[PDB]
């Protein structure tokens, strides 16, 4: 019995953005939080206070509410997952397991499609604010004498914040999880010799196929969380100019804000995927204990 399916994400059609079920649903919202801190050090862009208090939160509420619209679509997929993962409750109606599988992907892709499409105007607002941000940075009076103290100051704060999260623990865990998961995949394939009946092994293979999706999700965020860590440190160990042009300071703020927001985003997803992978490991093993009892 899967009780929460918050591990389903959706990307835009051109793949620039990534929607998640957990707040704030976009790493773009965490960038907007970061830029709040940058505006504190610049008096000429003091209006970002009102941008953040009003427009960014109004985007977050509309994000959360447009997510809530997919609620019925979410449990429709959730109702199919529980049928396919539990042999006893698959027996409560006769539909070809293959047909029920096709219904699962229909409803799934329908549900994931709901996440994207009902958030079309919210990505429009992420784009607006981003353009709104860059127009506001024009009000900095420096033109080529722009100070990089803020930039390198925030880098120092990030590096301390990157120490807090246990990357190695997350990394060690997935290496063991994937290594054993593939072993169960090879085992089931090799052992269906002795199994006369497939419905409980079909439930095993379904959970294993959903275990693959979450693993890849886990590796994507882990790979992008490492990427953020590595490249901000790469900025902290390189040349440190103290002055730069106005347009390159915009790039600068957008760079570190991006890397940190993505990191905060990955941190939010890895904790959830970690739970999801453990929970699916209990359902699989219960069916394995189910499978072996029927071997007699």
């Amino acid at each position: 019995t899967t009780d929460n399916i918050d591990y389903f994400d959706i990307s835009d059609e051109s793949n620039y953005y990534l929607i998640s079920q957990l707040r704030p649903h976009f790493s773009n919202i965490y960038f907007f939080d970061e830029f709040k801190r940058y505006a504190s050090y610049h008096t000429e862009i003091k209006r970002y206070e009102d941008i953040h208090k009003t427009k960014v939160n109004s985007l977050l509420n509309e994000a959360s509410r447009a997510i809530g619209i997919c609620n019925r679509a979410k449990n429709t997929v959730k109702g199919l997952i529980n049928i396919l993962e539990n042999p006893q409750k698959f027996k409560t109606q006769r539909e070809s397991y293959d047909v029920k599988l096709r219904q699962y992907e229909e409803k799934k892709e329908a549900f994931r499609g709901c996440l994207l499409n009902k958030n079309r105007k919210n990505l429009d607002q992420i784009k607006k604010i981003n353009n709104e941000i860059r127009d506001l940075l024009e009000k900095l009076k420096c033109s080529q004498d722009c100070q990089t103290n803020v930039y390198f100051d925030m880098i120092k704060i990030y590096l301390v914040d990157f120490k807090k999260m246990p990357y190695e623990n997350y990394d060690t865990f997935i290496k063991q999880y994937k290594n054993s998961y593939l072993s169960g995949v090879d085992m089931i394939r090799k052992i269906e010799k002795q199994i006369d009946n497939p419905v409980t092994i079909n439930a095993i293979k379904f959970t294993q196929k959903e275990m693959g999706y979450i693993i890849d999700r886990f590796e994507y965020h882990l790979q992008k969380v490492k990427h953020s860590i590595d490249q901000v440190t790469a900025l902290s160990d390189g040349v440190k100019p103290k002055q730069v042009t106005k347009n390159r300071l915009k790039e600068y703020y957008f760079n570190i804000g991006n890397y940190y927001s993505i990191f905060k985003f990955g941190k939010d997803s890895l904790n959830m995927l970690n739970k999801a992978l453990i929970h699916k490991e209990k359902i699989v093993h219960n069916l394995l204990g189910e499978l072996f009892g029927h071997l007699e």
């Epitope: 208090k53 024009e138 900095l140 009076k141």
Partner: antibody, heavy 118, light 108 residues
Framework: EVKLVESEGGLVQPGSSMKFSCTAS????????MAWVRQVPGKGLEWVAN????????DYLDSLKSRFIISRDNAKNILYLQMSSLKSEDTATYYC???????????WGQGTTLTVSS | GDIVMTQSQKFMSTSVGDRVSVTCKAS??????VAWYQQKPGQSPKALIY??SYRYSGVPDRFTGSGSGTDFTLTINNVQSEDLAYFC?????????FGGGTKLEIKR
């Protein structure tokens, strides 16, 4: 495309009051600062006041912070400028203007004439 | 309290084919925070350029903006009879302030 339509203007005696309004269409009212600008016929422009997105912080020209109130109704997409204790110096054509993130005025209404006279 | 934008020239003589630059002086350094407006006879002002140099969409490319710091200039290529007044505006600090305006005085 973007339309700013100001209420009818009028003639007022010194000391009385008049409230102007401005209805906005063709853009998300709540996404922009809005402002009022006044111009004496044949003369230059003068900024009067402006209002932020939710209407929490209005700001004015110091001389008029006393007598002028700017307000917004985001649900009805209308900007208001309430004036009190008016004088002859206040006679002008008042423009409803949409303010940029920086402080520019991207779009202007057609103006509404206020005449202060006995 | 005070920033003054000065358009010292109230009228500027020109011809229809010409290209003319209109100047606006700021009392202090306002960086790039300058915008340019036109006002034809009997019309509300219309925006042309912001950030001293950036042209709004749909504004003809015969309008160009230059300047930084305290001296800003609007350039109007291929003058037309329909052209008249031009106002500069600073949005660096409150209160916002406009220049006195400059009108083209065409010779025929």
């Amino acid at each position: 495309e973007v339309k700013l339509v100001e209420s009818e203007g009028g003639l007022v005696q010194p000391g009385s009051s008049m409230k102007f309004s401005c209805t906005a269409s063709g853009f998300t009212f709540s996404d922009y600062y809005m402002a009022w600008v006044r111009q004496v016929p044949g003369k230059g422009l003068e900024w009067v006041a402006n209002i932020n997105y939710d209407g929490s912080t209005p700001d004015y020209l110091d001389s008029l912070k006393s007598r002028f109130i700017i307000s917004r109704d985001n649900a009805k997409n209308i900007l208001y400028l309430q004036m009190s204790s008016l004088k002859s110096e206040d006679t002008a054509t008042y423009y409803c203007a949409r303010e940029t993130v920086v402080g520019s005025f991207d779009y202007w209404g057609q103006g509404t004439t206020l005449t202060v006279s006995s | 309290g005070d920033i003054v934008m000065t358009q010292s020239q109230k009228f500027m003589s020109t011809s229809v084919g010409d290209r003319v630059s209109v100047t606006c002086k700021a009392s202090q350094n306002v960086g790039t925070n300058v915008a340019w407006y036109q006002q034809k006879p009997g019309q509300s002002p219309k925006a042309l350029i912001y950030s001293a140099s950036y042209r709004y969409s749909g504004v003809p490319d015969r309008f160009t903006g230059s300047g930084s710091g305290t001296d800003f200039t609007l350039t109007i290529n291929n003058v037309q009879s329909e052209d008249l007044a031009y106002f500069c505006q600073q949005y660096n600090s409150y209160p916002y302030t406009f220049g006195g305006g400059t009108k083209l005085e065409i010779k025929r």
